[PDB]
Amino acid sequence: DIFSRLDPPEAEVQIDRLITGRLQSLQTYVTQQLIRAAEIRASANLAAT
Amino acid sequence: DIFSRLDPPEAEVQIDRLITGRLQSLQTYVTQQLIRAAEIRASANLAAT
């Protein structure tokens, strides 16, 4: 929709903002999966023991 | 300050920069609390044992 109603010079800025925001979303997601996977791993170690 | 002396269209972009920077600080706080919470739980599991 950005392109449909805006020129490239300004559309690159608007899309870059959305990219940064959604890229931050992925960093939040992956960081939490690593922290939570360490907890299930500690539980799997207890269950194996 | 910003909104009061400047221009609303510009104040909005600068306030969004403050929101983003402060949100990133606050999200960093929460990530480190989850990493530290696992260390306290690991110690508490040893103390219970």
Side-chain angles (χ1 to χ4, degrees):
Chain A
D1 289 345
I2 292 168
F3 285 123
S4 294
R5 294 184 292 166
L6 182 66
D7 65 31
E10 297 295 323
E12 290 177 354
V13 173
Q14 294 298 309
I15 293 169
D16 288 344
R17 181 64 178 172
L18 291 173
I19 291 168
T20 298
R22 290 178 179 174
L23 183 59
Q24 183 177 8
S25 294
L26 291 173
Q27 292 297 308
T28 298
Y29 177 79
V30 72
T31 299
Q32 291 177 2
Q33 293 298 99
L34 270 59
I35 293 169
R36 187 178 298 108
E39 292 178 354
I40 298 301
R41 183 177 65 196
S43 180
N45 287 335
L46 180 60
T49 299
Chain B
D1 186 24
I2 292 168
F3 187 77
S4 294
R5 296 182 294 168
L6 180 63
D7 191 21
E10 295 296 322
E12 290 176 354
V13 173
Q14 291 178 32
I15 293 169
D16 288 344
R17 290 178 180 174
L18 291 173
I19 292 168
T20 298
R22 291 178 180 174
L23 180 60
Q24 291 177 333
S25 179
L26 183 58
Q27 291 177 333
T28 299
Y29 176 79
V30 172
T31 298
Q32 292 179 333
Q33 293 298 308
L34 271 60
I35 293 169
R36 291 179 180 175
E39 183 64 20
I40 297 301
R41 179 65 182 272
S43 180
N45 287 357
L46 181 59
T49 300

PDB file of all heavy atoms in Angstrom, chain A residues 21-48:
ATOM      1  N   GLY A  21      10.961  -2.625  12.801  1.00  0.00           N
ATOM      2  CA  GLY A  21      10.038  -3.088  13.817  1.00  0.00           C
ATOM      3  C   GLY A  21       9.828  -4.586  13.811  1.00  0.00           C
ATOM      4  O   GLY A  21       9.903  -5.234  14.863  1.00  0.00           O
ATOM      5  N   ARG A  22       9.567  -5.161  12.639  1.00  0.00           N
ATOM      6  CA  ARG A  22       9.353  -6.594  12.550  1.00  0.00           C
ATOM      7  C   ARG A  22      10.630  -7.398  12.717  1.00  0.00           C
ATOM      8  O   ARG A  22      10.568  -8.536  13.171  1.00  0.00           O
ATOM      9  CB  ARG A  22       8.722  -6.945  11.209  1.00  0.00           C
ATOM     10  CG  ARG A  22       7.279  -6.495  11.045  1.00  0.00           C
ATOM     11  CD  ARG A  22       6.746  -6.840   9.702  1.00  0.00           C
ATOM     12  NE  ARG A  22       5.361  -6.427   9.546  1.00  0.00           N
ATOM     13  CZ  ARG A  22       4.661  -6.514   8.398  1.00  0.00           C
ATOM     14  NH1 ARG A  22       5.230  -6.996   7.316  1.00  0.00           N
ATOM     15  NH2 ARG A  22       3.403  -6.110   8.357  1.00  0.00           N
ATOM     16  N   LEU A  23      11.774  -6.842  12.378  1.00  0.00           N
ATOM     17  CA  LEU A  23      13.025  -7.498  12.701  1.00  0.00           C
ATOM     18  C   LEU A  23      13.279  -7.550  14.201  1.00  0.00           C
ATOM     19  O   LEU A  23      13.772  -8.563  14.709  1.00  0.00           O
ATOM     20  CB  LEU A  23      14.186  -6.774  12.007  1.00  0.00           C
ATOM     21  CG  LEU A  23      15.570  -7.406  12.192  1.00  0.00           C
ATOM     22  CD1 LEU A  23      15.554  -8.831  11.653  1.00  0.00           C
ATOM     23  CD2 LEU A  23      16.613  -6.563  11.472  1.00  0.00           C
ATOM     24  N   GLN A  24      12.915  -6.497  14.931  1.00  0.00           N
ATOM     25  CA  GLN A  24      12.944  -6.559  16.384  1.00  0.00           C
ATOM     26  C   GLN A  24      12.022  -7.635  16.940  1.00  0.00           C
ATOM     27  O   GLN A  24      12.348  -8.266  17.956  1.00  0.00           O
ATOM     28  CB  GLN A  24      12.565  -5.198  16.974  1.00  0.00           C
ATOM     29  CG  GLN A  24      12.645  -5.134  18.490  1.00  0.00           C
ATOM     30  CD  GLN A  24      12.332  -3.750  19.028  1.00  0.00           C
ATOM     31  OE1 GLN A  24      11.904  -2.863  18.286  1.00  0.00           O
ATOM     32  NE2 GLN A  24      12.545  -3.558  20.324  1.00  0.00           N
ATOM     33  N   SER A  25      10.873  -7.854  16.303  1.00  0.00           N
ATOM     34  CA  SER A  25       9.981  -8.928  16.736  1.00  0.00           C
ATOM     35  C   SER A  25      10.639 -10.294  16.672  1.00  0.00           C
ATOM     36  O   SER A  25      10.495 -11.107  17.589  1.00  0.00           O
ATOM     37  CB  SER A  25       8.727  -8.934  15.882  1.00  0.00           C
ATOM     38  OG  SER A  25       7.973  -7.772  16.089  1.00  0.00           O
ATOM     39  N   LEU A  26      11.348 -10.576  15.592  1.00  0.00           N
ATOM     40  CA  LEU A  26      12.063 -11.824  15.459  1.00  0.00           C
ATOM     41  C   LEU A  26      13.188 -11.967  16.471  1.00  0.00           C
ATOM     42  O   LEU A  26      13.395 -13.065  16.993  1.00  0.00           O
ATOM     43  CB  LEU A  26      12.632 -11.944  14.041  1.00  0.00           C
ATOM     44  CG  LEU A  26      11.599 -12.126  12.922  1.00  0.00           C
ATOM     45  CD1 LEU A  26      12.295 -12.057  11.570  1.00  0.00           C
ATOM     46  CD2 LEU A  26      10.885 -13.458  13.102  1.00  0.00           C
ATOM     47  N   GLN A  27      13.902 -10.894  16.772  1.00  0.00           N
ATOM     48  CA  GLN A  27      14.933 -11.003  17.792  1.00  0.00           C
ATOM     49  C   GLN A  27      14.357 -11.307  19.160  1.00  0.00           C
ATOM     50  O   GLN A  27      14.951 -12.084  19.915  1.00  0.00           O
ATOM     51  CB  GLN A  27      15.755  -9.712  17.857  1.00  0.00           C
ATOM     52  CG  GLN A  27      16.608  -9.456  16.626  1.00  0.00           C
ATOM     53  CD  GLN A  27      17.668 -10.522  16.425  1.00  0.00           C
ATOM     54  OE1 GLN A  27      18.433 -10.837  17.340  1.00  0.00           O
ATOM     55  NE2 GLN A  27      17.720 -11.085  15.223  1.00  0.00           N
ATOM     56  N   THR A  28      13.229 -10.695  19.501  1.00  0.00           N
ATOM     57  CA  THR A  28      12.571 -11.024  20.753  1.00  0.00           C
ATOM     58  C   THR A  28      12.141 -12.485  20.787  1.00  0.00           C
ATOM     59  O   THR A  28      12.392 -13.191  21.778  1.00  0.00           O
ATOM     60  CB  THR A  28      11.347 -10.119  20.990  1.00  0.00           C
ATOM     61  OG1 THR A  28      11.771  -8.751  21.077  1.00  0.00           O
ATOM     62  CG2 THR A  28      10.634 -10.509  22.274  1.00  0.00           C
ATOM     63  N   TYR A  29      11.528 -12.956  19.702  1.00  0.00           N
ATOM     64  CA  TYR A  29      11.062 -14.332  19.650  1.00  0.00           C
ATOM     65  C   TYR A  29      12.207 -15.325  19.841  1.00  0.00           C
ATOM     66  O   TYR A  29      12.114 -16.232  20.676  1.00  0.00           O
ATOM     67  CB  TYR A  29      10.347 -14.597  18.323  1.00  0.00           C
ATOM     68  CG  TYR A  29       9.889 -16.028  18.152  1.00  0.00           C
ATOM     69  CD1 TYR A  29       8.736 -16.469  18.786  1.00  0.00           C
ATOM     70  CD2 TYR A  29      10.621 -16.900  17.359  1.00  0.00           C
ATOM     71  CE1 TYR A  29       8.317 -17.775  18.630  1.00  0.00           C
ATOM     72  CE2 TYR A  29      10.201 -18.207  17.202  1.00  0.00           C
ATOM     73  CZ  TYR A  29       9.055 -18.645  17.835  1.00  0.00           C
ATOM     74  OH  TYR A  29       8.639 -19.947  17.678  1.00  0.00           O
ATOM     75  N   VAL A  30      13.290 -15.168  19.081  1.00  0.00           N
ATOM     76  CA  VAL A  30      14.355 -16.159  19.134  1.00  0.00           C
ATOM     77  C   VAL A  30      15.077 -16.121  20.475  1.00  0.00           C
ATOM     78  O   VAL A  30      15.460 -17.167  21.007  1.00  0.00           O
ATOM     79  CB  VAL A  30      15.370 -15.914  18.001  1.00  0.00           C
ATOM     80  CG1 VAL A  30      16.195 -14.667  18.285  1.00  0.00           C
ATOM     81  CG2 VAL A  30      16.270 -17.130  17.839  1.00  0.00           C
ATOM     82  N   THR A  31      15.267 -14.936  21.054  1.00  0.00           N
ATOM     83  CA  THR A  31      15.923 -14.869  22.357  1.00  0.00           C
ATOM     84  C   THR A  31      15.125 -15.614  23.419  1.00  0.00           C
ATOM     85  O   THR A  31      15.692 -16.371  24.213  1.00  0.00           O
ATOM     86  CB  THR A  31      16.131 -13.408  22.798  1.00  0.00           C
ATOM     87  OG1 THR A  31      16.971 -12.736  21.852  1.00  0.00           O
ATOM     88  CG2 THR A  31      16.777 -13.353  24.174  1.00  0.00           C
ATOM     89  N   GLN A  32      13.809 -15.451  23.424  1.00  0.00           N
ATOM     90  CA  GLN A  32      13.030 -16.194  24.395  1.00  0.00           C
ATOM     91  C   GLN A  32      13.023 -17.695  24.154  1.00  0.00           C
ATOM     92  O   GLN A  32      12.962 -18.456  25.119  1.00  0.00           O
ATOM     93  CB  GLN A  32      11.590 -15.674  24.410  1.00  0.00           C
ATOM     94  CG  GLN A  32      11.439 -14.272  24.973  1.00  0.00           C
ATOM     95  CD  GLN A  32      10.008 -13.774  24.911  1.00  0.00           C
ATOM     96  OE1 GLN A  32       9.105 -14.490  24.471  1.00  0.00           O
ATOM     97  NE2 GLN A  32       9.792 -12.540  25.354  1.00  0.00           N
ATOM     98  N   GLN A  33      13.077 -18.149  22.910  1.00  0.00           N
ATOM     99  CA  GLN A  33      13.113 -19.587  22.687  1.00  0.00           C
ATOM    100  C   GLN A  33      14.391 -20.209  23.213  1.00  0.00           C
ATOM    101  O   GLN A  33      14.351 -21.326  23.729  1.00  0.00           O
ATOM    102  CB  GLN A  33      12.962 -19.899  21.195  1.00  0.00           C
ATOM    103  CG  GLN A  33      11.600 -19.545  20.621  1.00  0.00           C
ATOM    104  CD  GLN A  33      10.477 -20.334  21.268  1.00  0.00           C
ATOM    105  OE1 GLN A  33       9.792 -19.840  22.169  1.00  0.00           O
ATOM    106  NE2 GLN A  33      10.279 -21.564  20.811  1.00  0.00           N
ATOM    107  N   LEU A  34      15.517 -19.513  23.092  1.00  0.00           N
ATOM    108  CA  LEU A  34      16.763 -19.996  23.660  1.00  0.00           C
ATOM    109  C   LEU A  34      16.729 -20.047  25.173  1.00  0.00           C
ATOM    110  O   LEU A  34      17.246 -20.996  25.763  1.00  0.00           O
ATOM    111  CB  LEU A  34      17.926 -19.101  23.210  1.00  0.00           C
ATOM    112  CG  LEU A  34      18.623 -19.523  21.911  1.00  0.00           C
ATOM    113  CD1 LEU A  34      17.608 -19.555  20.777  1.00  0.00           C
ATOM    114  CD2 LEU A  34      19.754 -18.552  21.604  1.00  0.00           C
ATOM    115  N   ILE A  35      16.153 -19.038  25.819  1.00  0.00           N
ATOM    116  CA  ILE A  35      16.083 -19.045  27.277  1.00  0.00           C
ATOM    117  C   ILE A  35      15.126 -20.127  27.767  1.00  0.00           C
ATOM    118  O   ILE A  35      15.413 -20.836  28.731  1.00  0.00           O
ATOM    119  CB  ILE A  35      15.634 -17.676  27.816  1.00  0.00           C
ATOM    120  CG1 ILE A  35      16.705 -16.617  27.542  1.00  0.00           C
ATOM    121  CG2 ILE A  35      15.335 -17.762  29.305  1.00  0.00           C
ATOM    122  CD1 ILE A  35      16.242 -15.200  27.795  1.00  0.00           C
ATOM    123  N   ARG A  36      14.001 -20.294  27.091  1.00  0.00           N
ATOM    124  CA  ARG A  36      13.057 -21.344  27.451  1.00  0.00           C
ATOM    125  C   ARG A  36      13.534 -22.741  27.083  1.00  0.00           C
ATOM    126  O   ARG A  36      13.153 -23.703  27.743  1.00  0.00           O
ATOM    127  CB  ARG A  36      11.718 -21.089  26.776  1.00  0.00           C
ATOM    128  CG  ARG A  36      10.596 -22.020  27.209  1.00  0.00           C
ATOM    129  CD  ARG A  36       9.312 -21.679  26.543  1.00  0.00           C
ATOM    130  NE  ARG A  36       8.862 -20.340  26.882  1.00  0.00           N
ATOM    131  CZ  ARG A  36       8.878 -19.290  26.037  1.00  0.00           C
ATOM    132  NH1 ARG A  36       9.324 -19.442  24.809  1.00  0.00           N
ATOM    133  NH2 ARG A  36       8.447 -18.109  26.442  1.00  0.00           N
ATOM    134  N   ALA A  37      14.337 -22.893  26.040  1.00  0.00           N
ATOM    135  CA  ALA A  37      14.854 -24.213  25.714  1.00  0.00           C
ATOM    136  C   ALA A  37      15.872 -24.709  26.726  1.00  0.00           C
ATOM    137  O   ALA A  37      16.017 -25.919  26.898  1.00  0.00           O
ATOM    138  CB  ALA A  37      15.462 -24.206  24.315  1.00  0.00           C
ATOM    139  N   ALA A  38      16.589 -23.808  27.379  1.00  0.00           N
ATOM    140  CA  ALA A  38      17.490 -24.184  28.453  1.00  0.00           C
ATOM    141  C   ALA A  38      16.757 -24.748  29.658  1.00  0.00           C
ATOM    142  O   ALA A  38      17.314 -25.582  30.370  1.00  0.00           O
ATOM    143  CB  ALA A  38      18.320 -22.981  28.873  1.00  0.00           C
ATOM    144  N   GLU A  39      15.533 -24.322  29.899  1.00  0.00           N
ATOM    145  CA  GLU A  39      14.736 -24.794  31.016  1.00  0.00           C
ATOM    146  C   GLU A  39      14.168 -26.183  30.787  1.00  0.00           C
ATOM    147  O   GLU A  39      14.106 -26.980  31.723  1.00  0.00           O
ATOM    148  CB  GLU A  39      13.592 -23.816  31.292  1.00  0.00           C
ATOM    149  CG  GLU A  39      14.038 -22.463  31.827  1.00  0.00           C
ATOM    150  CD  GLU A  39      12.893 -21.515  32.048  1.00  0.00           C
ATOM    151  OE1 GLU A  39      11.789 -21.850  31.690  1.00  0.00           O
ATOM    152  OE2 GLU A  39      13.121 -20.452  32.578  1.00  0.00           O
ATOM    153  N   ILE A  40      13.735 -26.475  29.564  1.00  0.00           N
ATOM    154  CA  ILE A  40      13.240 -27.792  29.207  1.00  0.00           C
ATOM    155  C   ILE A  40      14.392 -28.770  29.092  1.00  0.00           C
ATOM    156  O   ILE A  40      14.256 -29.961  29.386  1.00  0.00           O
ATOM    157  CB  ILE A  40      12.457 -27.752  27.883  1.00  0.00           C
ATOM    158  CG1 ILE A  40      11.229 -26.846  28.014  1.00  0.00           C
ATOM    159  CG2 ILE A  40      12.044 -29.155  27.465  1.00  0.00           C
ATOM    160  CD1 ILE A  40      10.270 -27.274  29.102  1.00  0.00           C
ATOM    161  N   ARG A  41      15.560 -28.277  28.695  1.00  0.00           N
ATOM    162  CA  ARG A  41      16.757 -29.096  28.693  1.00  0.00           C
ATOM    163  C   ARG A  41      17.177 -29.495  30.100  1.00  0.00           C
ATOM    164  O   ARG A  41      17.568 -30.642  30.321  1.00  0.00           O
ATOM    165  CB  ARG A  41      17.902 -28.356  28.019  1.00  0.00           C
ATOM    166  CG  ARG A  41      19.191 -29.150  27.894  1.00  0.00           C
ATOM    167  CD  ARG A  41      20.242 -28.386  27.173  1.00  0.00           C
ATOM    168  NE  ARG A  41      20.658 -27.205  27.915  1.00  0.00           N
ATOM    169  CZ  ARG A  41      21.354 -26.178  27.391  1.00  0.00           C
ATOM    170  NH1 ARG A  41      21.703 -26.199  26.123  1.00  0.00           N
ATOM    171  NH2 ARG A  41      21.687 -25.150  28.151  1.00  0.00           N
ATOM    172  N   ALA A  42      17.101 -28.574  31.053  1.00  0.00           N
ATOM    173  CA  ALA A  42      17.389 -28.912  32.436  1.00  0.00           C
ATOM    174  C   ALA A  42      16.398 -29.921  32.988  1.00  0.00           C
ATOM    175  O   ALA A  42      16.767 -30.759  33.804  1.00  0.00           O
ATOM    176  CB  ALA A  42      17.393 -27.653  33.293  1.00  0.00           C
ATOM    177  N   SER A  43      15.150 -29.861  32.544  1.00  0.00           N
ATOM    178  CA  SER A  43      14.134 -30.827  32.918  1.00  0.00           C
ATOM    179  C   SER A  43      14.359 -32.185  32.280  1.00  0.00           C
ATOM    180  O   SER A  43      14.158 -33.211  32.929  1.00  0.00           O
ATOM    181  CB  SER A  43      12.765 -30.304  32.529  1.00  0.00           C
ATOM    182  OG  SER A  43      11.762 -31.217  32.881  1.00  0.00           O
ATOM    183  N   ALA A  44      14.744 -32.213  31.012  1.00  0.00           N
ATOM    184  CA  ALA A  44      15.107 -33.458  30.368  1.00  0.00           C
ATOM    185  C   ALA A  44      16.324 -34.118  31.005  1.00  0.00           C
ATOM    186  O   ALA A  44      16.397 -35.348  31.045  1.00  0.00           O
ATOM    187  CB  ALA A  44      15.347 -33.212  28.885  1.00  0.00           C
ATOM    188  N   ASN A  45      17.269 -33.332  31.523  1.00  0.00           N
ATOM    189  CA  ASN A  45      18.402 -33.890  32.246  1.00  0.00           C
ATOM    190  C   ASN A  45      17.998 -34.521  33.567  1.00  0.00           C
ATOM    191  O   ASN A  45      18.567 -35.544  33.946  1.00  0.00           O
ATOM    192  CB  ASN A  45      19.455 -32.822  32.477  1.00  0.00           C
ATOM    193  CG  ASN A  45      20.200 -32.464  31.221  1.00  0.00           C
ATOM    194  OD1 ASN A  45      20.290 -33.270  30.287  1.00  0.00           O
ATOM    195  ND2 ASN A  45      20.735 -31.270  31.179  1.00  0.00           N
ATOM    196  N   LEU A  46      17.074 -33.905  34.287  1.00  0.00           N
ATOM    197  CA  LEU A  46      16.517 -34.471  35.499  1.00  0.00           C
ATOM    198  C   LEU A  46      15.722 -35.737  35.230  1.00  0.00           C
ATOM    199  O   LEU A  46      15.865 -36.719  35.964  1.00  0.00           O
ATOM    200  CB  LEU A  46      15.618 -33.440  36.190  1.00  0.00           C
ATOM    201  CG  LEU A  46      14.955 -33.903  37.493  1.00  0.00           C
ATOM    202  CD1 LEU A  46      16.030 -34.275  38.507  1.00  0.00           C
ATOM    203  CD2 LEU A  46      14.058 -32.795  38.030  1.00  0.00           C
ATOM    204  N   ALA A  47      14.889 -35.734  34.197  1.00  0.00           N
ATOM    205  CA  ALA A  47      14.164 -36.933  33.806  1.00  0.00           C
ATOM    206  C   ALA A  47      15.074 -38.065  33.366  1.00  0.00           C
ATOM    207  O   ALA A  47      14.795 -39.211  33.695  1.00  0.00           O
ATOM    208  CB  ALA A  47      13.179 -36.618  32.691  1.00  0.00           C
ATOM    209  N   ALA A  48      16.125 -37.791  32.603  1.00  0.00           N
ATOM    210  CA  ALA A  48      17.086 -38.830  32.257  1.00  0.00           C
ATOM    211  C   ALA A  48      17.825 -39.392  33.463  1.00  0.00           C
ATOM    212  O   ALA A  48      18.040 -40.605  33.537  1.00  0.00           O
ATOM    213  CB  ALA A  48      18.089 -38.302  31.243  1.00  0.00           C
TER     214      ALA A  48
END
